[PDB]
Amino acid sequence: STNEFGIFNSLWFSLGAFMQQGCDISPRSLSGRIVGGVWWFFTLIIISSYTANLAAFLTVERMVSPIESAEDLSKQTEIAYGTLDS
Amino acid sequence: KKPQKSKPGVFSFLDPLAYEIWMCIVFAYIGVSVVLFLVSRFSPYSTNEFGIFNSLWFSLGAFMQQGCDISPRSLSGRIVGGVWWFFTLIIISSYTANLAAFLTVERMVSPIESAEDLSKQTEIAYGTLDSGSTKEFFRRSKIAVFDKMWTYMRSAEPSVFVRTTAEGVARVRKSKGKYA
Amino acid sequence: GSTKEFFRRSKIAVFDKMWTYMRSAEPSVFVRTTAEGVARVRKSKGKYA
Amino acid sequence: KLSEQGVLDKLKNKWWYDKGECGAKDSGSKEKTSALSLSNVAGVFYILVGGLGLAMLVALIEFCYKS
Ligand SMILES: N[C@@H](Cn1oc(=O)[nH]c1=O)C(=O)O
């Protein structure tokens, strides 16, 4: 007779599950634990995905080209051009 | 050929591991829960709550590193709780490395653009319109990066020279980026 | 010696780049004796070959 | 006569350089990393399933110290 899953607790179980944190609340039903199971496997991929890509930014640098091939020169209106008189 | 990206499968997230590993993970997840089930449900056992509904759930929470409700209060239960923890420590950490290994290799993949890269990339073959002005421009070439091409374009097998430009566009379209 | 003359009449392009460099490096990368030639390795701690 | 003017050295530059090379051209961009095999992570399973059996032996020696 203890339904501890309110609308305000269901956010809180799901949040620390996204933030790799241990929750005091656990589902106690087969219809409940399938929800918490696949939500756990979701965040396991995503945090590893965030860690993997941010390494790839820091390992391999790639400095972008602001302007290229004179079509970008027409659309860009931040830069000032320079030419030589006489 | 303009390299549009190949869309992955929906089941491409698990590509850092092999699918032979993942099937062995599930077979391990089944056996570990049942071994803990026999340890827990012993004939003199007091208050040992780890049934087949709990030990299936405890090993899942231990595998996903999201804690658990309760821990096994028995020495043989702590052994299987111990080795599953060292199991799921490695498998998660090994997944993080190979997923980083895919992405660090992928950003090192650079498109050949400066024609020195084209002078060094023997994987992509390159040819010209024969009997024009391009083929003669490499004939009387005085630059070593141009000299390597005219060394190659005369010596590549088969004929990289193409009679018409429409077929010259076609050998780009047919090779899907294997030809320049 | 014989090393400096071997790069003088050089016919390999990887050797040709050195003799292009060793004549043109500043200051003198040529060393009069071998004991000082070991010493410019020891002084540079890996900055010199 | 050919060596003092480097005709033979150019022929050394001729025949070993024209045959195609195997250098950094296939060490440069002919690698993509594989997935992990089972054999890379196989020994974890031996510690795991070996830990499964070692849990079973201590459960049986509790049966002696319970009786
Ligand atoms: N139009 C050119 C022939 N040509 O077109 C190319 O795209 N390459 C080439 O040599 C000529 O007057 O010789």
Ligand 1 pocket check: which of B126, B128, B133, B167 to mutate, most ligand atoms within 8 Å of Cβ? B133
Report CB contact under 8 Å: D38, B105. no
| CB A39 within 8 Å of CB A17 | yes
Asked how this structure was determined, the answer is cryo-EM
**Residue nearest to ligand 1 atom 4, measured at CA:** B132
This PDB structure is determined at a resolution in Å of 4.2
DSSP-derived 3-state class of residue B99:
helix
Task: Tell me the torsion sign for CA atoms B37, B40, B43, B48.
Answer: negative
**Residue nearest to ligand 1 atom 5, measured at CA:** B132
- Establish, for the pair of chains A and B, how many residue pairs have beta carbons separated by less than 8 Å: 54
Q: Tokens 């203890």 belong to which residue?
A: A2
- State the number of CA atoms in the 13 A half-sphere of D25 facing the CB: 13
CA pair distance B113, B149, nearest whole angstrom: 15
Q: How far is CA A35 from the centre of its chain?
A: 21
Helical ranges in B41-143 per DSSP H? 52-63, 75-108, 117-120, 134-139
DSSP-derived 3-state class of residue B179:
strand
Task: Tell me the torsion sign for CA atoms D2, D6, D8, D10.
Answer: negative
CA distances from B135 to B122, B127, B141, B154, D28 (A): 19, 9, 10, 10, 28
Residues of B at the annotated binding site for L-glutamate? Answer: 133-134
| CB A55 within 8 Å of CB B105 | no
- Residues from chain B that touch D47, judged by Cβ atoms under 8 A, are 83, 86-87
| CB D57 within 8 Å of CB B120 | no
| Closest ligand 1 atom to Cα of B133 | 10
